[PDB]
Amino acid sequence: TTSGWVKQDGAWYYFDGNGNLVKNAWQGSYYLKADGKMAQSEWIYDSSYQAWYYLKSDGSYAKNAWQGAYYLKSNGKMAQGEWVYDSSYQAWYYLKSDGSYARNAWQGNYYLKSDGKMAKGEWVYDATYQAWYYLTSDGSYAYSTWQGNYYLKSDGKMAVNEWVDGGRYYVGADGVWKEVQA
Ligand SMILES: C[N+](C)(C)CCO
Ligand SMILES: C[N+](C)(C)CCO
Ligand SMILES: C[N+](C)(C)CCO
Ligand SMILES: C[N+](C)(C)CCO
Ligand SMILES: C[N+](C)(C)CCO
Ligand SMILES: C[N+](C)(C)CCO
Ligand SMILES: C[N+](C)(C)CCO
Ligand SMILES: C[N+](C)(C)CCO
């Protein structure tokens, strides 16, 4: 009898302790498919974990990693319809329900930049609205409030050439409240 990992007819198989092929199951970091062949460079849906996994070229599952537009979490599970923090890039991302990362787009009160990174404590220009927005320290857009000498209106858009904040302050066309006091 045989136990452990065995390569046969071009594929890797895993023999369990009773010398039998493991099929439709994990063995360590590796997944054995319906015919017993080790998954490699491919996506697998595990019905028991209710999640997609990506097996890399060496057979081991991807974790804390991108595969194309898709993110595998620390437990290997593909992210779906959720926020994740990638500690290696020090960046938040939003993975849509289809799995692919959001980019150049709002998600709730948050904005994902062109490479998917959530904006945070920074100004962004929304090409579709043709207006500046300010994302606060937690990512959520500022509204009905000042950021420095600029005012974000109730929909978050930067004010220009108008009276703002209870009609008390005038911002010029450049958006700046020009401070001239006695
Ligand atoms: C990564 N998924 C398998 C979930 C989609 C592939 O297009
Ligand atoms: C390590 N295994 C033998 C499981 C596969 C080699 O890629
Ligand atoms: C753009 N990301 C790096 C965030 C994923 C692409 O693989
Ligand atoms: C093997 N799983 C990927 C299912 C869990 C991580 O240990
Ligand atoms: C609000 N602006 C983007 C115009 C300037 C601040 O960076
Ligand atoms: C709440 N988000 C996850 C969207 C950003 C972290 O503050
Ligand atoms: C002085 N600012 C106008 C910038 C803030 C007023 O609250
Ligand atoms: C989320 N936006 C800033 C795009 C609109 C909120 O009113």
Residue numbers in the entry: 92 to 273
Can you provide the manuscript's text about this entry?
Here, we describe the functional characterization and the three-dimensional structure of CbpL from S. pneumoniae. The functional protein has 3 well-differentiated domains connected by linker regions that provide flexibility to the general structure. Taken together, these results indicate that CbpL is a CBP non-covently attached to the phosphorylcholine of pneumococcal teichoic acids. Our studies indicated that CbpL plays a critical role both in pneumococcal lung infections and in transmigration from nasopharynx to the lungs and blood, therefore pointing to a direct role of CbpL in host-pathogen interactions.
Crystallization trials with full-length CbpL systematically resulted in proteolysis of the sample through the linker regions and only the choline-binding module (CbpLCBM) was incorporated into the crystals. The crystal structure presents three residues of the N-term linker (Thr92-Ser94), the CBM that is composed of nine choline-binding repeats (residues Gly95-Glu270), and three more residues from the C-term linker (Val271-Ala273). The overall shape of the CbpLCBM is approximately a triangular prism of 81 Å high and 22 Å side with the choline-binding sites placed along the three lateral faces of the prism. CbpLCBM is folded in a left-handed superhelical arrangement of the choline-binding repeats, each of them comprising a β-hairpin followed by a loop and a coiled region that is linked to the next repeat, as previously reported in other CBPs15161726. The β-hairpin units stack along the structure (from N to C-terminal end) following a 120° counterclockwise rotation in such a way that choline-binding sites are formed at the interface of two consecutive β-hairpins. The crystal structure of CbpLCBM:choline complex shows that eight choline-binding sites are available. Remarkably, CS and NCS alternate along the CbpLCBM starting from a CS formed between R1 and R2 repeats.
